Amino acid sequence: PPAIGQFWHVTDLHLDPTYHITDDHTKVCASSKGANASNPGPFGDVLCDSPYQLILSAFDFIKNSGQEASFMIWTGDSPPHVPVPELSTDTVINVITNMTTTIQSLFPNLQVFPALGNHDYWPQDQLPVVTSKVYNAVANLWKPWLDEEAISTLRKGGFYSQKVTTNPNLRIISLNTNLYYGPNIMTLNKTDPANQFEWLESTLNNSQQNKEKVYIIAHVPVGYLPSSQNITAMREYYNEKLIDIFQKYSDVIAGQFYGHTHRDSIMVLSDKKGSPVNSLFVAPAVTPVKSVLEKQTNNPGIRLFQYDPRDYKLLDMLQYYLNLTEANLKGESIWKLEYILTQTYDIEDLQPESLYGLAKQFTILDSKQFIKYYNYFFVSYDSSVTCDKTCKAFQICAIMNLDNISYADC
Ligand SMILES: *[C@@H]1O[C@H](CO)[C@@H](O)[C@H](O)[C@H]1NC(C)=O
Numbered sequence: 001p002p003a004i005g006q007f008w009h010v011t012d013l014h015l016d017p018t019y020h021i022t023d024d025h026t027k028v029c030a031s032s033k034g035a036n037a038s039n040p041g042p043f044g045d046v047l048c049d050s051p052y053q054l055i056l057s058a059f060d061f062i063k064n065s066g067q068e069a070s071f072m073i074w075t076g077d078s079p080p081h082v083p084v085p086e087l088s089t090d091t092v093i094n095v096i097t098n099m100t101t102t103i104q105s106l107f108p109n110l111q112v113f114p115a116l117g118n119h120d121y122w123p124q125d126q127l128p129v130v131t132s133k134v135y136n137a138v139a140n141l142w143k144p145w146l147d148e149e150a151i152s153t154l155r156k157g158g159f160y161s162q163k164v165t166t167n168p169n170l171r172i173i174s175l176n177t178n179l180y181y182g183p184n185i186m187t188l189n190k191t192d193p194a195n196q197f198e199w200l201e202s203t204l205n206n207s208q209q210n211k212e213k214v215y216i217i218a219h220v221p222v223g224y225l226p227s228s229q230n231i232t233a234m235r236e237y238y239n240e241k242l243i244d245i246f247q248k249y250s251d252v253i254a255g256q257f258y259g260h261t262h263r264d265s266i267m268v269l270s271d272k273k274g275s276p277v278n279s280l281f282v283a284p285a286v287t288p289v290k291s292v293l294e295k296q297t298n299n300p301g302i303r304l305f306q307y308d309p310r311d312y313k314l315l316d317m318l319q320y321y322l323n324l325t326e327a328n329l330k331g332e333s334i335w336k337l338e339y340i341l342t343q344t345y346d347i348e349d350l351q352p353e354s355l356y357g358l359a360k361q362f363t364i365l366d367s368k369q370f371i372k373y374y375n376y377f378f379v380s381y382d383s384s385v386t387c388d389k390t391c392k393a394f395q396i397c398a399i400m401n402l403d404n405i406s407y408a409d410c
């Protein structure tokens with residue numbers, strides 16, 4: 001292709017406005033909930049959500065990476081993990097405002113496509129089906145990036161679609177998958193919350209008939225969580241409905257992008273006959289936070305996709321990261337290239353057939369490919385991270401099998 005398009009994908013910033021270095025490591029960050037921060041530094045701690053400096057450094061690397069981009073995807077989760085009573089609607093909005101404002105200042109001429117996360121509401125997870133203060137606040141804040149039609153829908157349901165200014169036959173569809181997330185009590189027993197399904201189909205139909213391609217953008221991913229058994233993030237009923245819709249329109253959709261897990265994964269959606277037809281990419285978080293009882297977390301991550309500007313086919317992805325430990329040891333923001341996807345795995349591109357082939361390779365007995373994959377899953381938080389057979393089976397099946405029957409069968 002005569003030119004290469006690029007867009008950034010950042011997700012799960014989870015600013016902790018509370019963060020500051022002090023002698024009492026239980027007081028460094030409210031997001032540790034009273035636990036002693038492990039070894040805190042100017043760029044964060046594994047027991048804390050992101051300090052502002054960490055977030056700023058990610059956007060600063062972007063600015064100075066010497067990579068040109070046509071837009072940016074931003075899949076939500078801006079407030080920190082503190083208990084619900086410590087937060088409020090007002091504080092949540094300020095955090096979102098702050099992130100938005102911070103991006104708009106540093107990238108005054110970049111279109112950015114946001115999606116809401118499950119923490120982008122007070123109380124977390126309970127995102128509603130009708131307009132709400134938050135939905136109207138993000139609409140106001142995101143006007144510079146979106147048209148009136150998208151701003152309307154955003155106010156009513158927290159979802160929208162929008163054509164890309166530099167590639168107006170590419171349409172981004174930004175879903176509120178939070179509506180389908182297990183803990184969301186507001187949508188229980190609703191068949192089509194906020195009408196998203198009907199609006200999604202109708203939008204995908206329009207696209208298909210207007211010679212458009214679509215990138216789907218959302219917070220909670222479809223499918224099975226790669227580190228557990230028979231657990232989908234979304235309630236199964238909505239996972240299955242989205243799957244079938246994505247299969248009906250696998251032609252128009254040229255890629256899907258998700259966050260929420262804070263891990264680096266892929267999924268391959270196959271059509272009803274077992275043929276792979278859509279590639280899905282879960283990007284890891286900027287925040288490094290974990291629970292005290294977890295052995296692993298992710299290092300902070302930022303990524304860059306390459307696409308063919310004629311048909312919007314995905315050509316590659318570049319995953320960048322911050323070695324948290326190193327950065328705090330030196331007090332310097334060293335963002336680095338973790339991998340280039342086609343290089344580390346030797347596949348031609350990011351089309352479904354290529355990713356499917358890669359996943360098949362992971363099922364090799366003692367696959368080195370899968371081992372790599374597993375390290376990158378945690379954005380390289382520990383090299384020595386090994387994996388047992390059961391976990392591998394959970395990972396493999398989740399990559400290749402998104403609906404109930406297939407996954408069990410696997
Ligand atoms: C966002 O919040 C941080 C700490 O809460 C503050 O230092 C920073 O100045 C704020 N930025 C904007 C653009 O409001």
Ligand SMILES: *[C@@H]1O[C@H](CO)[C@@H](O)[C@H](O)[C@H]1NC(C)=O
Pocket residue numbers: 025026034035036
């Ligand atoms: C945190 O560390 C301090 C001093 O190192 C210790 O005395 C205190 O008990 C610890 N607190 C918790 C909650 O682990």
Ligand SMILES: *[C@@H]1O[C@H](CO)[C@@H](O)[C@H](O)[C@H]1NC(C)=O
Pocket residue numbers: 323325326329380381383
């Ligand atoms: C990051 O930093 C420390 C150097 O302080 C190192 O021991 C660890 O290997 C590094 N992580 C990676 C993925 O190389």
Ligand SMILES: [Zn+2]
Pocket residue numbers: 012014077117260261262285
């Ligand atoms: Zn998150």
Ligand SMILES: [Zn+2]
Pocket residue numbers: 077117118119219260261
């Ligand atoms: Zn989330």
